[PDB]
Amino acid sequence: LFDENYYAKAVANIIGEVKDPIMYKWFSPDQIEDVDLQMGYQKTVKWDAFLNANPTTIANEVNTISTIGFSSEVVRLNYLKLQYKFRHLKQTSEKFYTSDSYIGDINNNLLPFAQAYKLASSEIIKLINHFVLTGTVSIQKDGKNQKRLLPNMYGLLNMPEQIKEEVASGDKDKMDKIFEKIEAGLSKLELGDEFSTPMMVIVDPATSLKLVKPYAAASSCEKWEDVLIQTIKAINNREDVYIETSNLLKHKILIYPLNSELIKFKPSKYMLPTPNEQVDKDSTDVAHSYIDFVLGGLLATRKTILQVNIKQS
């Protein structure tokens, strides 16, 4: 195959230079499992029980007893397929653009296939990481003009039925109020019997800068980060707490456990960028190539994610 397909050989040679996605640091190794589906849905069935009314006292003659009801919930995870197209120089035309320092046309922004594919794959991986983190797909810093996705496709930031806290605009620079909101969210968190698990907290650079100030005369030794770690340990049974900083987040703090039973990522095995067999050729030196990727597959239980938004009004 490599003898007949130069582009496949170039992709195989250059695939090692693409860096690993940063979303791997947000999940435990057991929290990620691949699924073999390019586009479609996966269905999971769970059973639940509830008490309809107060129990019935057995006295004298009685045959009308309170009933215990049952229910079956189905969770459907949608997987969508997306594609990008990029232009590059034809393989036989490289020698006419091989400069002493580089290969390509600076004046027309034309690149060899390997470099073009590497850059496009890096950009697509950045977009995938942003989608995984935030639950939205957009190329604008404003966050508008979002692509209309399918239902049941959510990220860690927009997952419904989770604890949400808001810090007022006047208290945006008040670490005490921010930590009070965090305490309220942690108290409202419900981990059940899966509490003995490590926790992960993701903050923006502003919160990271604010966390190193002394705890409050302020405490001489302990810091706000240490106080937060102790508070999270109190609820996770003194397990590990991992703090991470992401430039994607803005005035938002995300707390969630690293347990596969509560939150699990089941991405498609073709989620990461993959070249397409079709290559657009012409009588000129410019060719076009396609990269496919798959999005979707985040599952979580209700009331297990704390999202604190600090309003900057």
Binding site: L1, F2, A8, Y24, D34, E277
Partner: protein, 37 residues
């Protein structure tokens, strides 16, 4: 059947894509192994 193995000679584009997926999975496993929190 991964691109890491030099002795692996792909036959067609389906095998190439499968090798790419296996390479991605192995890279994730290696990253998780190397990571020390």
């Amino acid at each position: 059947a991964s691109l890491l193995d030099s002795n692996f000679v792909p036959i067609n584009f389906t095998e190439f894509v499968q090798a790419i997926s296996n390479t991605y999975k192995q890279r994730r496993i290696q990253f998780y192994e190397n990571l020390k929190r």
